[PDB]
């Protein structure tokens, strides 16, 4: 399914049970609207691809991990394995994420 990281904590936390399957991250902007609409996508491949594990991270309630990746661009998605960064992207092309799974599928 997917998980909401409220700060850091959960972050690391999440990684460690993701074991050593891939793990990709959305970061969204509630307050905002645009970058709202494209959530039932991502939470979407949720269900369609039960072999990855998908986080939504908000940059208002954890701009604590943003600055982390330092996101100054929304929406944003990461590729994250083994708890190390492998891929990334900014950019609202949310068909892009399926060529993109496909990179290090």
Same mark, same amino acid.
């Given at each position: ?23 990709? &991250?959305?970061?969204?902007? +509630?307050?905002?609207?645009?970058? !709202?609409?494209? %959530?039932?996508?991502?939470? *979407?491949?949720?269900? /369609? ?21 330092? &996101?100054?661009?929304?929406? +944003?998605?990461?590729?994250?394995? !083994?708890?190390? %960064?492998?891929?990334?992207? *900014?950019?609202?092309? /949310? ?11």
């Amino acid at each position: 399914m997917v998980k909401q990281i409220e700060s850091k904590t959960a972050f690391q936390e999440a990684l460690d049970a993701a074991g050593d399957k891939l793990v990709v &991250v959305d970061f969204s902007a +509630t307050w905002c609207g645009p970058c !709202k609409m494209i %959530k039932p996508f991502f939470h *979407s491949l949720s269900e /369609k691809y039960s072999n990855v594990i998908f986080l939504e991270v908000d940059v208002d309630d954890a701009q604590d991990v943003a600055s982390e990746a330092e &996101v100054k661009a929304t929406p +944003t998605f990461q590729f994250f394995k !083994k708890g190390q %960064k492998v891929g990334e992207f *900014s950019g609202a092309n /949310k068909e892009k994420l399926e060529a993109t799974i496909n990179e290090l599928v």
